[PDB]
Amino acid sequence: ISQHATDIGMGPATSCYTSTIPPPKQVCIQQAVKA
Amino acid sequence: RSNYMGNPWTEYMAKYDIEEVHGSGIRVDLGEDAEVAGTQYRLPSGKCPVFGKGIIIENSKTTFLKPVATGNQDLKDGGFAFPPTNPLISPMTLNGMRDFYKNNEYVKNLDELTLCSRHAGNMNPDNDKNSNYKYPAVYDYNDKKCHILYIAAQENNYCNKRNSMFCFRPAKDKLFENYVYLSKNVVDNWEEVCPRKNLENAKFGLWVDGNCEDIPHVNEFSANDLFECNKLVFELSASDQPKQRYKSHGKGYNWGNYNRETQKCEIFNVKPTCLINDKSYIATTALSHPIEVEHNFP
């Protein structure tokens, strides 16, 4: 079930992100994604 | 022996060698793995854009591009797309992306599909130390919008109750005709090396002893028109969906010869190596647009 979610392509529970294309900028999801 | 030599079709037919040019699943693309904070994840990796592909969520064909449910929302209230951020990253118009990347000469002039793919591959989770994870995306030709997909899953039908996991499946549909499903690996020269147009007055064949021969074995599915034939080829194409090792690497029923007069979709899983000029036929692929044709032979 946890394995099944991974096997079908469900991604990481993530809140904050940083660009890989310059300039470095933090972006966060204000409210948590429903899991 | 040299039974396959002197093929004048080699360069022209390169884009139809789907294991080579795309190299992953089409219906379901999960051709790569990415490690994020100790856990291994699956992600789309096909090198070609998939024209007309969308995700149907429990009969609804108008929900998958809606942002994923956040905060107090129940899971079934949202779709698959990236939720709103400050500043907004998704969705973003083509003009918005060209303006956003105006100082980056390696990004700002990319074609719309490659630009959407590179924009979706930009924001990396802070948990992902090695920057492995790159989100897939959907480009919508109707309003020129790039939609980053927070959910990389394409099929689930483990599914059901507003907070339980929704059931979903990939498909070509009239409502998805202007969409393009894009993995993180979409090549910048897809226009040159990937399929797009259906080939009018042409049928795929195999080059043998200086002649283009018919595909010896085909699977015949009745189809009212080219669109229905393209939908059937897509439904049977390369899939990385777990069957219970789960990687197709592009192998599958990816091609179809559509006879418009007999209304037969002649589906096959071996790469074609030439074209036969036949006015009764239209040559389609699972990657191809379900409508657009190229009137001229080759």
Residue numbers in the entry:
A (entry chain B): 2036 to 2070
B (entry chain A): 102 to 258, 262 to 264, 269 to 352, 389 to 442
According to the publication:
Two of these, Apical Membrane Antigen 1 (AMA1) and the Rhoptry Neck (RON) complex comprising RON2, RON4 and RON5, play a crucial role at the MJ.. In this invasion model, AMA1 and the RON complex then bind together linking the merozoite and erythrocyte membranes to form an essential structural component that maintains the MJ ring. The receptor-binding site on P. falciparum and T. gondii AMA1 (PfAMA1 and TgAMA1, respectively) comprises a region on Domain 1 of the ectoplasmic domain termed the hydrophobic groove and a region immediately adjacent that becomes exposed when the mobile Domain 2 (D2) loop (residues Ser347-His393) is displaced by the incoming ligand. We have determined the crystal structure of AMA1 from P. vivax (PvAMA1) in complex with a 39-residue peptide corresponding to the extracellular region of RON2 from P. vivax (PvRON2sp1) and, in addition, the structure of the cross-reaction complex formed between PvRON2sp1 and PfAMA1.
The heterocomplex PfAMA1-PvRON2sp1 was crystallized using recombinant PfAMA1, comprising domains D1 and D2 only, from strain FVO. The PfAMA1(FVO) polypeptide chain was traced from Arg102 to Pro442 with gaps Gly259-Arg261, Lys265-Ser268, Tyr353-Asp388 (the D2 loop); 33 of the 39 residues of the PvRON2sp1 peptide were traced from Ser2037 to Lys2069. As with the homocomplex, the bound peptide in the PfAMA1(FVO)-PvRON2sp1 heterocomplex adopts a boomerang shape. A disulphide-bridged β-hairpin formed by the central segment between the two cysteine residues constitutes one wing, and the flanking N- and C-terminal segments form the other wing. The buried surface at the PfAMA1(FVO)-PvRON2sp1 interface of the heterocomplex is 3115 Å2, larger than that of the P. vivax homocomplex. The structural differences between PfAMA1(FVO) of the heterocomplex and apo PfAMA1(3D7) are, as with the PvAMA1-PvRON2sp1 complex, largely confined to some of the loop segments that contact the ligand. The loop 172–176, which is disordered in the apo PfAMA1(3D7), could be completely traced in the heterocomplex, revealing a conformation closely matching that found in the PfAMA1 homocomplex. The loop 226–233 is displaced by more than 5 Å upon forming the complex and is essentially identical in conformation to this segment in the PfAMA1-PfRON2sp1 homocomplex. The loop 264–274, which is disordered in apo PfAMA1, contacts the N-terminal region of PvRON2sp1 but could only be partially traced. By contrast, Thr2055 (PvRON2sp1) in the heterocomplex is much closer to Arg2041 (PfRON2sp1) in the P. falciparum homocomplex as the Cα positions differ by only 0.6 Å, clearly illustrating that the P. vivax ligand partially adapts to the PfAMA1 binding site.
